[PDB]
Structure 1
């Protein structure tokens, strides 16, 4: 069960969402970033982007209220994560996912350093991109941000860091 403080890391961002990993670190899917971030000129931030995974490091502490959590490069295969989806209506929609393997993918012409998974009635929509994939290890670990799903809904992909 994900607690409110965890949910509160999920933040409306561009055409999708992002996740406050720590008071200074925000992660999201590259193709939702618009073309200032939370009232910071672009020169303020350490932006690292690769494979549809964007990470922002801010200068000032943007979410002092959070404890920093562990950002892993994906998760061990087979693992079950929760996808912490917020809808524009405010509904919280935690989706459980059995994580397949990490792999380079080409999805609608973009290179995704991603990890696939199977759902476990509900599925992802456009607008859900950037929502975090998480599991608890006395910790909560974030291993990905939502990037794609198949025309169906069975399989979803999250972009992972390198």
Structure 2
């Protein structure tokens, strides 16, 4: 399965990493890349954004359609163990680096001292600082599903997943 241009267009530079437009109003990212002490995101006041964060997973729901060109996709809490996902990595240069990953267990993990509710996976035939927030996706029938955001790596990578 090959990620089409529209799907890549959802991957958005954000803070010290990236985030992903799940739908016209819903944006997900990894908590530690989110700018702190700001009063707005994407030009919208914080008061107009419903924000939920836990275990390195951050979700924003805007009041205004921010990406009205997009269809809504399904966001799941991780994926079945053994699913081969693609991590849609954009680099600052603009290069697209889709990485195939075989996913393992959803678990509470501690990474550099902080609790991450996430899912591990093994890179198939790496990730670097700056890549956090990139989405983990897989195609199920007609639709692409997003199931985590990149959070950490050792061969093994971890995405944060929604609880």
TM-score range for the pair, normalised by the shorter chain length: over 0.9
Q: Which residue of 1 aligns with 2:60?
A: 56
CA distance in 2, matches of 1:110, 1:43: 28
Unaligned runs of 5+ residues in structure 2 are none
Aligned-pair CA distance for 1:41: 1.1
Runs of 4+ off more than 2 Å: none
CA deviation profile, 1:75-100 (whole Å, cap 9, x unmatched): 00010000000000000000000001
Q: Indicate the RMSD between aligned Cα atoms, in angstroms.
A: 0.4
Aligned-pair CA distance for 1:110: 1.1
CA distance in 2, matches of 1:51, 1:128: 18
CA deviation profile, 1:112-156 (whole Å, cap 9, x unmatched): 000000001xx0001000000000000100000000000xxx000
CA distance in 1, matches of 2:111, 2:49: 28
CA distance in 2, matches of 1:51, 1:40: 25
Aligned-pair CA distance for 1:6: 0.2
TM-score of the pair, normalised by structure 1: 0.96
Unaligned runs of 5+ residues in structure 1 are none
CA distance in 2, matches of 1:93, 1:48: 28
2:34 paired with 1:33: yes
CA deviation profile, 1:14-72 (whole Å, cap 9, x unmatched): 00000000000000000000111000111110000000000000000000000000000
CA distance in 2, matches of 1:129, 1:22: 20
**3-state SS in 2 of match to 1:7:** helix
CA distance in 2, matches of 1:58, 1:111: 27
CA distance in 1, matches of 2:75, 2:31: 17
Deviates more, 1:105-114 or 1:87-96: 105-114
